[PDB]
Amino acid sequence: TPLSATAALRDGAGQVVGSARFVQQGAGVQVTVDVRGLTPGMHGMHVHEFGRCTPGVPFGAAGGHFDPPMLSVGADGVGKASFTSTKISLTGENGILNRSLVIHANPGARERCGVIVRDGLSVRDYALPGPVDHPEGVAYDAKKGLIYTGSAQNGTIYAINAQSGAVTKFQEGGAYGRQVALGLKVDPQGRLWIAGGAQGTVSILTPDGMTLAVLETPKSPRPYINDLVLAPDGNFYVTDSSRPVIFRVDKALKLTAWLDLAGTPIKYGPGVNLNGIAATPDGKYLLAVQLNTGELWRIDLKTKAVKKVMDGLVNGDGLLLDGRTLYVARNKDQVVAKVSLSADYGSGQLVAQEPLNGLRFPATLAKVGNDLVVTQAQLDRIGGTPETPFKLTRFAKF
Ligand SMILES: [Cu+2]
C-alpha cells in the first residue's frame, strides 16, 4: 500500500473547492491539483508549516512557508496541476503530512488552503494543556483506562482518560527527583515508574498520584536516566544514555549498577547512547537501542553477554516489543519503525517505517488496548518554540 495524502482545498468562506493528491514515489512525490474559482494566470502554490486553514488575514493560521511549482488557471477559473517533486516528501524529518497546501494570488494574499491528510490511516490525537509540556514517556493502566505521560521539561505527569480524552494532572512536577519525567512504565500493581533524566533518579508513584519512593543512582558527572522496563524476572532494568551503565531495581526497590558497559561491544560516544529498552517475554534477554549509533543490542539476563542485533536505527528512542515485532520511535526522522526479529532475538530486519499522519519528534511508545500510542515530544524544541498544543497520537498496530 503506497504512502499518499489528500488535501481538500478550501476558500475563505470554508467551502471545499478543490483537491490536491500526493503520492510518494521513491524519493519523489507525485502531486495532482484541481481547484476552481481562481483568477486566470499563474498562482503561487506552497506548503506552509501548520495544518490549519483558519484565520490567523485569511488562512493566517497556516503559518509561514515550510522550507526544510506554480499553479496555472485557465480563463474559466480552473487550476490544474500535475508534477513530480523531489523537494517535498510525505515521510522523514521534512515530511509534509498534517501541514498545509496554500495557493496565493500572484505569481501575495492566500486564496486557498487545505490540510494535508494521510490517506488510509486513522489516528487519534490527545492534546495536552501546557505551553512547555514536552511529553516524553507514556504508559497505560488498562484497569483504570488511563494513559499517563510525563513532561521532560518540568516533571508533571498528566493522566488522560483513553476513552474521553479528558486530561488531568496525575502529579504536578517540581519536587526532589520529580523535576523531569522521561521513560514511564506501569507495573502490575498500577504503580508508575519514572525515569528522571539529568536528575539521576528513578521515581515510583502509587495509583493515587502520591510518591512512593525516589531512588538515586550513584553521584557521578552527567547522569541521564532515560528509560526503563519491567522484565519477567520481576526486576526493572534502567538505561542511562550518558553514563555507560545499566541499572537494575529489584522487587524490594533496591537500585544497583547491574552492567558496566565499558569493555562490552557497546561503546558510548557523544550524544544519546542507550535509551529505549525492552525485555523479551521468555525472560532471557533485554533489547536496548543506542540512539547515536543506531545499533540494537541484545543483553543476556543470566550471563550479561551482549550481542549486536542489527544496525540502521539512528535516532531510535523508545522501544515497544510485541512478540517478534519491535516498534522503534525514530525521533528526528519523525517515524515509527517496525523491526522483525528472529526467534532468538539475535537478528532483525527493518521492514517498515511509518510517518502516521505527521509526527513531531516522536519519543516513546505504549500499548493502549488494541492500539499503540506515541508521544510527540518536540524535544528538539525544548528551550525554543514548540508547536502547541503538545499531543500524544494513538494509532493501529502495523
Ligand atoms: Cu506561501
Numbering used by the authors: 25 to 80, 89 to 100, 122 to 160, 172 to 462
Which lines from the publication concern this structure?
Here, we show a unique type of Cu/Zn-SOD from Deinococcus radiodurans (DrSOD) with an additional β-propeller domain.
To elucidate the structure of calcium-free DrSOD, we also analyzed the DrSOD crystallized in the presence of equimolar copper and zinc ions but without the addition of calcium ions. Under these conditions, crystallization occurred at a relatively acidic pH (pH 4.0), which likely hindered the zinc binding (top). Nevertheless, the overall structure of calcium-free DrSOD crystallized under acidic conditions was nearly superimposable with that of the calcium-bound form crystallized at pH 8.0, with an RMSD of 0.305 Å between calcium-free and calcium-bound DrSOD in chain A. Both crystal structures contain two molecules in the asymmetric unit with no significant differences between them; therefore, the comparison was focused on chain A in both structures. The side chain of Asp339 in the calcium-free DrSOD adopted an orientation away from the center of the β-propeller, resembling the orientation away from the calcium ion in the calcium-bound form of DrSOD (bottom). While it remains uncertain whether the crystals obtained in the presence of calcium ions contain a mixture of calcium-bound and calcium-free DrSOD molecules, the orientation of the Asp339 side chain pointing toward the calcium ion was exclusively observed in the calcium-bound form.
